[PDB]
């Protein structure tokens, strides 16, 4: 949502320094391992019975890529995350029944995974910009909940 032009540059600059597929696979996998109730939604994914199984699971990795490709498209529309995620908001609410609190948790995993990959380059200022982004994505995903 409201990031300055400079803040947007900070975000998009660092995004070009990571490999999105890795960020997505690892963020989703950490979500499943750190908050195991989230596994309730992924019964079709097969073996999620340990962190090793989760990180070795092809379906988790593939789904992580779809999640992160949608995140990447969000980064190109920071001034309209509500519009950008409207269809996905409907999907998560009407079809999947995911409580919106979990959007915040996955956002937090994306933040932690970015720090894991970027190290000291993920400064306190960079983290603050990314928290604003994931907060906005979570708000947008929760918008069509009814």
């Amino acid at each position: 949502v409201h990031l300055t032009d400079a803040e947007k540059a900070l975000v998009t600059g660092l995004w070009g320094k990571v490999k999105p597929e890795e960020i997505g696979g690892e963020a989703l996998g950490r979500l499943l391992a750190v908050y195991p109730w989230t596994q309730r939604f992924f019964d079709s994914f097969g073996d999620l019975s340990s962190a090793s199984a989760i990180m070795g699971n092809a379906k988790v990795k593939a789904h992580g890529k779809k999640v992160i490709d949608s995140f990447s498209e969000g980064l190109k529309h920071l001034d309209n995350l509500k519009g950008t995620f409207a269809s996905l908001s409907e999907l998560h609410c009407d079809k999947l029944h995911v409580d919106p609190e979990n959007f915040k948790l996955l956002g937090n995993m994306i933040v932690i995974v970015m720090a894991h990959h970027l190290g000291k380059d993920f400064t306190p200022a960079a983290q603050s910009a990314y928290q604003k982004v994931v907060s906005g994505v979570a708000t947008a995903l929760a918008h069509k909940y009814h």
Binding site: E26, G29, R30, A33, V34, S50, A51, S52, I54, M55, N108, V111, I112, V113, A115, H116, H117, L118, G119, K120, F122, P124, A125, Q127, S128, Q131
Partner: protein, 141 residues
């Protein structure tokens, strides 16, 4: 509760932190102030600029408390009892802020210990910090 594997992961991770505890606590605090500016008013006397001395000193106090806790995984309420009084009765810290600082400490560890911060270790450390925060907020009443 913390499993045997959790305890193993927490011990391993805190061994890896070792002498850098104060640095990481200071950074966790800086990250919290930057991402969540509402938290700054808990420390009105602080210079919160990068690398400030009071932040480093307080980071050291937090690090010391967490190191002691990591050697007390089976009696956290007893070990953190005095700190629980301070944070609830005296400081009246909003419980949300413990989640904020815990997240920032995890960000800090991931940024510093990439080889060691596996998903399994992350899950164990999240439980450790949540367990510590639980004790620190146990005494509003």
């Amino acid at each position: 509760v913390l499993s045997a594997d959790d305890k193993a992961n927490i011990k391993a991770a805190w061994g890896k932190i070792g002498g850098h505890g104060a640095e990481y606590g200071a950074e966790a605090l800086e990250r919290m102030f930057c991402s969540f500016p509402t938290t700054k008013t808990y420390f009105p006397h602080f210079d919160v600029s990068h690398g400030s001395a009071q932040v480093k000193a307080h980071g050291g106090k937090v690090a010391d408390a967490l190191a002691t806790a990591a050697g007390h995984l089976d009696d956290l309420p007893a070990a953190l009892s005095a700190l629980s009084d301070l944070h609830a009765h005296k400081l009246r810290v909003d419980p949300v802020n413990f989640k904020l600082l815990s997240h920032c400490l995890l960000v800090t560890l991931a940024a510093h210990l990439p080889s060691d911060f596996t998903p399994a270790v992350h899950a164990s450390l999240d439980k450790f910090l949540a367990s510590v925060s639980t004790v620190l907020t146990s005494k509003y009443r």
